[PDB]
Amino acid sequence: GMSTQENVQIVKDFFAAMGRGDKKGLLAVSAEDIEWIIPGEWPLAGTHRGHAALAALLQKASEMVEISYPEPPEFVAQGERVLVVGFATGRVKSTNRTFEDDWVFAITVRKSKVTSIREYIDTLALARATN
Amino acid sequence: GMSTQENVQIVKDFFAAMGRGDKKGLLAVSAEDIEWIIPGEWPLAGTHRGHAALAALLQKASEMVEISYPEPPEFVAQGERVLVVGFATGRVKSTNRTFEDDWVFAITVRKSKVTSIREYIDTLALARATNFNAT
């Protein structure tokens, strides 16, 4: 659908399914060829494409870091384009080092499924935290 | 919602005066208390506040980096916000090191003036390319 508010809600549902660890609900709102690009040099960095990749990224993130969001994220959206603006604090479990990150996730929804994600993050800060 | 057409044109005018080097024009669309936040550890990092700082930032950028935008950016606008999504290639003059950067500029427009800018950039890449020059 073309509705900005409906596409924002799809994005929220995507996030929430990941929060619940609802693997089936997450996939239900994700394109079979979903592409998620994470920049930098840290364990989650890379281009993750498809359902298998999405499930694997979810698990890897859960195991590698503890993350908190002090405030709810902001949505800036127009039609099928949904930009999420937020801030996280985290602790890398392997290093026990903490980090902070002001981020944007730029998302494209197509036919009501999350299709493209690119993260814009403090790659230097994440690299330092993970060595 | 409120129409964003005007805000997007102001943001386009902001870069318009930028690339033209229209000092008086660029500040003509810049709030007197304009805040521009640049993350990371490289010469342009920090929060640049006010018109003098804006001018100094643009001068310092011209002195230390060559930057190219191969394709036009995308504007995503809602409310008082305009997020500009783009891609740059560049070269750091002092080190001769090259980089590419996928970036977002998150902009707030109020009273027809750009009031806040925060960049989201590849801070690791820019630190490497500048040899971590926080100055």
Residue B131 tokens, joined: 């040899």
A125 neighbors B123 (Cβ within 8 angstroms): yes
* B26 vs B21: CA distance, rounded Å: 8
Structural contact between residues B57 and B37, judged by C-beta atoms closer than 8 angstroms: no
Closest listed residue to residue A15, CA positions, set A36, A1, A41: A36
**What single-letter DSSP state applies at residue A122?**
B
Q: Which chain B positions have a beta carbon within 8 Å of A75's beta carbon?
A: 78
Nearest to B102 among A41, A76, A118 (CB): A118
The experimental resolution of this structure, in angstroms, equals 1.6
Rg of chain B's alpha carbons, rounded to an integer?
15
Domain boundaries along the sequence of chain A? 1-131
CATH, range A1-131: 3.10.450.50
| Closest in B40, B78, B118 to A124, CB measured | B40
Give the residue among B96, B127, B101, B116 at the shortest CA–CA distance from B31: B116
d(CA B78, CA B24): 28
Cβ-based contacts of B104 with chain A (< 8 Å): 83, 104, 106, 120
User: DSSP states of chain B as a string?
Assistant: ----HHHHHHHHHHHHHHHHT-HHHHHHTEEEEEEEEE-SSSTT-EEEEHHHHHHHHHHHHHHHEEEE-SSPPEEEEETTEEEEEEEEEEEETTT--EEEEEEEEEEEEETTEEEEEEEE-BHHHHHHHTTT---
Q: CA of A105: which chain B residue's CA is closest?
A: B104
Q: Which amino acid, A110?
A: R
Rounded Cα distance, B113 and A93, in Å: 44
Smallest CA–CA distance, residue A70 to chain B, in Å, is 19
- Closest in A77, A120, A126 to B78, CB measured: A77
SS3 A68: strand
Q: Tokens standing for B92?
A: 């750091």
Report the phi/psi class of residue B40: left, alpha or beta, with left for phi > 0 and alpha for psi in -120 to 50: left
Residue A67, φ and ψ in degrees, nearest 5: -125, 145
Residue at token pair 């690339």: B19
Go through A98-116 and write b for each residue having 16 or more CB atoms within 10 A of its CB, e for each that does not.
ebebbbbbbbbbeeebbbb
Please answer whether residues B50 and B77 qualify as being in contact, where contact means their C-beta atoms are separated by less than 8 angstroms: no
Second-level CATH architecture of B1-135: Roll (3.10)
